[PDB]
Design a protein around this ligand. Sequence first.
Ligand SMILES: Nc1ncnc2c1ncn2[C@@H]1O[C@H](COP(=O)(O)OP(=O)(O)O)[C@@H](O)[C@H]1O
Ligand SMILES: Nc1ncnc2c1ncn2[C@@H]1O[C@H](COP(=O)(O)OP(=O)(O)O)[C@@H](O)[C@H]1O
Ligand SMILES: Nc1ncnc2c1ncn2[C@@H]1O[C@H](COP(=O)(O)OP(=O)(O)O)[C@@H](O)[C@H]1O
Ligand SMILES: Nc1ncnc2c1ncn2[C@@H]1O[C@H](COP(=O)(O)OP(=O)(O)O)[C@@H](O)[C@H]1O
Ligand SMILES: Nc1ncnc2c1ncn2[C@@H]1O[C@H](COP(=O)(O)OP(=O)(O)O)[C@@H](O)[C@H]1O
Ligand SMILES: Nc1ncnc2c1ncn2[C@@H]1O[C@H](COP(=O)(O)OP(=O)(O)O)[C@@H](O)[C@H]1O
Ligand SMILES: Nc1ncnc2c1ncn2[C@@H]1O[C@H](COP(=O)(O)OP(=O)(O)O)[C@@H](O)[C@H]1O
Ligand SMILES: Nc1ncnc2c1ncn2[C@@H]1O[C@H](COP(=O)(O)OP(=O)(O)O)[C@@H](O)[C@H]1O
Ligand SMILES: Nc1ncnc2c1ncn2[C@@H]1O[C@H](COP(=O)(O)OP(=O)(O)O)[C@@H](O)[C@H]1O
Ligand SMILES: [K+]
Ligand SMILES: [K+]
Ligand SMILES: [K+]
Ligand SMILES: [Mg+2]
Ligand SMILES: [Mg+2]
Ligand SMILES: [Mg+2]
Lengths: 7, 7, 7, 7, 489, 489, 489
Amino acid sequence: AAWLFEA
Amino acid sequence: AAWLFEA
Amino acid sequence: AAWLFEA
Amino acid sequence: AAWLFEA
Amino acid sequence: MKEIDELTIKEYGVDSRILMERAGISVVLAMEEELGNLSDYRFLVLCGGGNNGGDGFVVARNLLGVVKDVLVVFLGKKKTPDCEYNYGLYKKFGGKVVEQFEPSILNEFDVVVDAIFGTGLRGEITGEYAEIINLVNKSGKVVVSVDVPSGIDSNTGKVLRTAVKADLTVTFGVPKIGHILFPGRDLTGKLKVANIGHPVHLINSINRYVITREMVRSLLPERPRDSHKGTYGKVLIIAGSRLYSGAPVLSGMGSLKVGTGLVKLAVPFPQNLIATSRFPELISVPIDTEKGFFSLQNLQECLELSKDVDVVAIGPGLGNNEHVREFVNEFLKTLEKPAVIDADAINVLDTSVLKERKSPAVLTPHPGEMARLVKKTVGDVKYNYELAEEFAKENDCVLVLKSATTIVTDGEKTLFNITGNTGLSKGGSGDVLTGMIAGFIAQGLSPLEASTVSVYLHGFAAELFEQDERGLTASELLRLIPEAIRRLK
Amino acid sequence: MKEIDELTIKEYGVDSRILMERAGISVVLAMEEELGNLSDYRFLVLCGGGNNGGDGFVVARNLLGVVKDVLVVFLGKKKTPDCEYNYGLYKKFGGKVVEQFEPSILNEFDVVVDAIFGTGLRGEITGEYAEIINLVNKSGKVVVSVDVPSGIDSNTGKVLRTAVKADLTVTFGVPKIGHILFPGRDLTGKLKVANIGHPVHLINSINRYVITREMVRSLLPERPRDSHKGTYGKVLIIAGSRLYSGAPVLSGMGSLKVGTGLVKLAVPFPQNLIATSRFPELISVPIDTEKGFFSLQNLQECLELSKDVDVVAIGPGLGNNEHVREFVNEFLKTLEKPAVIDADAINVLDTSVLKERKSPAVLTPHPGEMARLVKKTVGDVKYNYELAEEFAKENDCVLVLKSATTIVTDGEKTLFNITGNTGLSKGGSGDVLTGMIAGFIAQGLSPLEASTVSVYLHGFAAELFEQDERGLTASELLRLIPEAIRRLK
Amino acid sequence: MKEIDELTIKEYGVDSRILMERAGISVVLAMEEELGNLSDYRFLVLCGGGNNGGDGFVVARNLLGVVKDVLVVFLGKKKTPDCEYNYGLYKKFGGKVVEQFEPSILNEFDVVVDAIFGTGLRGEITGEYAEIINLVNKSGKVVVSVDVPSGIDSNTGKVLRTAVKADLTVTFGVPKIGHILFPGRDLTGKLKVANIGHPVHLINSINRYVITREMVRSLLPERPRDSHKGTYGKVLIIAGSRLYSGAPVLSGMGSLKVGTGLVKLAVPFPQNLIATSRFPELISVPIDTEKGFFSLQNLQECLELSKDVDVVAIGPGLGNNEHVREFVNEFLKTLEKPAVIDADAINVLDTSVLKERKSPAVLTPHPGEMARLVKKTVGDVKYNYELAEEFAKENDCVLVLKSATTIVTDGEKTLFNITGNTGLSKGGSGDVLTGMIAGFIAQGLSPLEASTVSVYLHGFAAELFEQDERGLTASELLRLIPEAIRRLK
Ligand SMILES: Nc1ncnc2c1ncn2[C@@H]1O[C@H](COP(=O)(O)OP(=O)(O)O)[C@@H](O)[C@H]1O
Ligand SMILES: Nc1ncnc2c1ncn2[C@@H]1O[C@H](COP(=O)(O)OP(=O)(O)O)[C@@H](O)[C@H]1O
Ligand SMILES: Nc1ncnc2c1ncn2[C@@H]1O[C@H](COP(=O)(O)OP(=O)(O)O)[C@@H](O)[C@H]1O
Ligand SMILES: Nc1ncnc2c1ncn2[C@@H]1O[C@H](COP(=O)(O)OP(=O)(O)O)[C@@H](O)[C@H]1O
Ligand SMILES: Nc1ncnc2c1ncn2[C@@H]1O[C@H](COP(=O)(O)OP(=O)(O)O)[C@@H](O)[C@H]1O
Ligand SMILES: Nc1ncnc2c1ncn2[C@@H]1O[C@H](COP(=O)(O)OP(=O)(O)O)[C@@H](O)[C@H]1O
Ligand SMILES: Nc1ncnc2c1ncn2[C@@H]1O[C@H](COP(=O)(O)OP(=O)(O)O)[C@@H](O)[C@H]1O
Ligand SMILES: Nc1ncnc2c1ncn2[C@@H]1O[C@H](COP(=O)(O)OP(=O)(O)O)[C@@H](O)[C@H]1O
Ligand SMILES: Nc1ncnc2c1ncn2[C@@H]1O[C@H](COP(=O)(O)OP(=O)(O)O)[C@@H](O)[C@H]1O
Ligand SMILES: [K+]
Ligand SMILES: [K+]
Ligand SMILES: [K+]
Ligand SMILES: [Mg+2]
Ligand SMILES: [Mg+2]
Ligand SMILES: [Mg+2]
């Protein structure tokens, strides 16, 4: 889930 | 259900 | 729900 | 769902 | 219904303001039922000068202080006494009225209440009225029409130049014909019928009805446990030709699917063999013909076959040539059984024969067949209930004039059917209905009752189709009939 | 509300018949909502001669032809103009009226509509009226009362000799005090309040209200994310004694459970240690006393502790002897902070001190404490809202008079609380409410707002108890408070 | 991060336009994730003259032909080269730009993209800029801020006169301090951090971090199966007084709930007995004191008790008077164990003592305690990370400066905690954290690690409370700690 965005 | 409205 | 009756 | 990818 | 209002006021003594109040609150309750909580919405109420507009002022007034915003645009140039009284109330309650309609005004509102014209509409809508109605139709707002969508003739369902297309219509006392017949049926959207206090005896004195589930349920014949096929009657179907070999099969199964005990088809050889290869429960009697069509040489054999049945259906796929004409008319003149007359039997019918017959008849034309039968245009006859009534009365028959809304009349009582969908707009569907009607007659219902139950069930079976309606065929419709019957109880 | 009707007629111009029509149909709709389809039931409508009876005639008339049976028993000896008009309609519509009530008549009916007396009741019910009401109460039929159950005084909720016990009461415009206060609250059964068309501005001009979920939700203080305990205030509770060591603990946690930042208790040593052994989140300051009770020797220390807080609650478990009296009165005379005054602090209070105080106060008596405070009988003060109003106004305070319906007034605005159940009828429950009120004051609500939110939440927490209410104790109530808060949004 | 951009361009060779492109598409993808399909929405993009505005032009351009409507309002008076390039693209792609902001323009749009100012903000916002930002804040539209909401200082989180309140903020590379500290944390709304292509080595070279779940999970000490209480360390807590008898209990259980093997409290008699009446797992040693407070006469006994433990926590509820001051300072000067120093031990601390100590320390002040400790105003110290850093470095300690965002620093590394809620804004919650920190030190974590894990877990336990947060008390928080630990893996 994490290549583009960190939550 | 039916005193006021018929469907 | 509320035009005619308040509970 | 559709800005980047069309299926 | 206009007589109903006036008797309720003048003879029962209900103040006309009381009726108008009840009408307006019915609209508010109906809208709540349909939109949920009203308090979020902004309402634009379009009021004419008549009592439809007066009902609108009642609506507007009862939304004050409870919804996000209300505005009345008053579009008339004088007010009836009750409209005037209710305008005065709306204003005393703090309501805003304007008399100029501004195109951009639609922007600031979520719901349009259409109280411009009701049953008092007379003539084509023009001028500002037409412009305002066209603006509302282009607006994509939620539209609630009071009594009838403005622009529909409430007696015929015709559009008078232009009309409002409503999401919801709230009408009073009883449905109006213009809600039931197209195009008006389409412009009505969802219809609610509100009780506004007329005495029940007056509401029930109306002689034109919508066929309802409860009426059909009470007409369904009984199935006593100690029975046999003869309990449930016998049908003869005289149908088909070398050109039209499928019609007999669809009519025959139509009678068997509604619970008839026995069905015999008389069809030209070898086409008769088509029926039992599909449905071996059918009896399909081979008729020897010269050229693949019924003629006078088959008269005696058909009368003979008629002796042992309760009802005869005639016409589907007979073809229309002179020898069929001779045969059909001489047959019906001598047949002393109820007759269901469809399709090519109507195309060649001499209506004098219906007057001579002692036995009953049902005729099942679509508007093209009715037009040819009475020598008028399709446009003259379509949805023409009064002509249908006159015809049934003059010819001592039941007339079932087929269309998306089907009319069933014996001249005294007229019923309207609103079940069905466009899956029935495909060859074969009429043939099935013919078998259904004959079947119910054979089971003991009157011609009028049989017709009433059949048109409803036929349309409701179409609605039970699982996939898209446009792919419904007559064979699938047949399969659905018993599910329609089950759901009806 | 009688002024509301008359302004709506005489100044807004709504015909009195329109109001009466709307009242009667409201009753029919309410009954349908509660009983389902009406068509199976037989209705006995008991009509007096006034406008309550007139509303009943409207009910009766609107059931004609739709239900199994309707009968009106007319019990008056003359009819108001609107009752007369509506009687005439019922009869023109084919309705049956009798004037003799026969005991056995209850047998043939399922529902009794009680339209004998509404707000026009004056004096004790006697004679045939009383007999008929007692017969209905013994009958085990479903009872629907129009406006107020006949026999309840709508201003006080008292029973006038005898009254109808209703399953459902439909009232118009606003709830009446007699629906809210006992015994009337009990005889009302389920209450529906119907909108019958009064302008909203008049309905909102009433100055006595039922505390509702929405009102409490809008009063709940905010919890900004960037906060710390000081954001949410500080409470000092002066409470307890060698006899009553538990009261401080219940009050203290009452303030913490509603979201107060810091709570300090001042309690006689060693009883102060009881609090932190239960709830170590509390600060429980030991007060050196001569004999286990607060006295004048503790005055200076308590004022000192008051300097660093936002509100002081005083009274739970202090005991009532002369040295407590001296201390409480001198303390309150010098305290320059809002004060919540409960229990033994009310028992020893000199009311002159409330007049001298510049700072605000809330008093939280039950009727026995209120009775002693004003030197009247419990019966004189219980549910006596006007005396409560007068008291709050004369003493510049908020008065919270506790009972199953709690009254909260500052003399100008009066609110009624109807949450809670008999689980709160047990020692300790008042102590919790005291902490809740102080807490909300510390969080920034006015004395009146804090009292309003607290009485509602306190009663609603009691209703959330999972087991039988009679086993609810104060400690469990404490645990439920945050669930009540969560459900309130 | 400004250095990060410039190294990525000048030394790694990534064209500045590539970074800006990636930034803008990140915003589009983020919005889609949050709003669903974009094609229904109308977008108003507010662009300044700098690179924040340049990112906005990229957003606008990538929405052309895909959404219902896009309009850029350009609010600057000259454009940086990359903003100019991207403005040119937006226009070549058919985009509409206006330079006058019209109040009513908000009406015709669903989403406001705020690309006015990013990290290039300097000084108070005034004039048209302020007016436009206030108009957007009043509008109730969905607001998406590019990089940082315009008006937040990205270094401090302060509002520069006025700032945008965003529903969603998309920032690039790493979170900025102004997203993490209040008020900016509140105005940021939901924060997404987008990878726009900086080398990972540069992104990881930042020395200030948000404490994350993964970091806390990797720091949790092991629980080898073959263990006993001594494996998991021993804590001494020196706490409480005759005034504050609850503090010791909350600190003690704080250490036991995070998995410490043994906890001993030293508390003045008889207050020590309070702890074991609640939690008999605790050892609560009675200390004989003259007046209910620790003093120099207890020094020798406390050092003796310190011999057999791994860590000493001191301060909660000690009170602040001269004899406590003498005792605390002489104790800490001689104690040769790690010390966790909280509450009144900070209030009386001589900071020279921290410089003399060979053993480590953690200090856990809220801003009022930090203010008194360094002789500044609360406003000077709150959220002042650089002062915290300087303090930790000068005094050779770890400083945990408590607030809704907690800062944890040893002078070299600074971490920010964003777990927790307003339920912790209530006395007792700090006492629990003190026990947690000491516990993790006893288990073998460094002072900095222990502090990092504790602030996170403490806040996350608060979030696990089942009911409304405002009713959370310290005792409930204690119960939630082990659930927080379980969820963390
Ligand atoms: N075609 C039309 N164009 C313009 N105005 C019309 C038209 N038809 C009717 N009206 C006006 O609208 C009035 C009332 O309509 P409606 O309210 O339905 O009648 P009623 O008052 O009988 O209920 C008519 O009496 C007439 O003056
Ligand atoms: N529901 C209907 N509405 C209008 N016209 C109809 C309808 N059904 C049939 N018609 C008319 O009748 C004609 C088709 O009928 P026809 O060819 O005589 O018999 P069939 O089509 O059943 O063999 C069409 O031209 C059509 O205008
Ligand atoms: N759109 C529609 N909605 C409802 N019923 C329809 C529709 N189109 C056709 N029908 C019904 O289907 C049947 C068509 O019969 P007919 O017109 O005799 O066609 P066919 O002769 O092709 O078998 C009639 O019962 C008619 O009422
Ligand atoms: N206690 C009583 N006993 C007998 N009759 C009463 C009593 N109280 C009131 N009534 C009668 O009932 C009438 C109307 O009651 P109601 O319908 O509530 O009044 P209104 O007509 O004001 O609405 C009174 O005006 C009175 O004549
Ligand atoms: N809700 C109530 N309704 C009627 N009376 C009450 C109520 N609450 C308390 N009382 C009266 O007060 C008395 C008990 O109060 P009291 O003993 O003075 O204080 P407490 O019971 O709180 O120690 C009872 O005799 C009772 O009549
Ligand atoms: N039956 C009941 N229904 C609703 N609330 C009740 C009931 N009985 C008691 N209460 C409430 O409980 C609390 C009792 O307080 P108080 O009478 O001071 O008792 P105590 O002093 O014993 O703690 C009040 O808030 C009262 O309104
Ligand atoms: N307080 C302010 N008021 C008005 N304009 C400002 C203010 N602060 C900054 N600006 C303008 O906005 C420009 C760019 O902001 P931003 O796009 O965040 O910078 P960068 O171009 O470094 O990314 C600044 O260089 C300046 O000209
Ligand atoms: N998170 C915080 N933000 C701002 N101020 C704070 C915070 N926590 C505490 N304070 C300040 O410190 C004061 C309360 O602290 P103090 O009374 O010295 O210790 P405690 O309240 O823990 O006994 C308040 O006046 C408040 O301004
Ligand atoms: N609104 C909030 N959000 C997150 N954490 C909070 C909030 N308010 C208080 N806290 C946390 O709760 C604890 C309060 O500690 P302290 O200020 O020492 O209070 P106390 O001394 O009353 O026990 C700190 O860890 C602080 O970071
Ligand atoms: K209309
Ligand atoms: K009554
Ligand atoms: K921005
Ligand atoms: Mg046909
Ligand atoms: Mg009490
Ligand atoms: Mg603290």
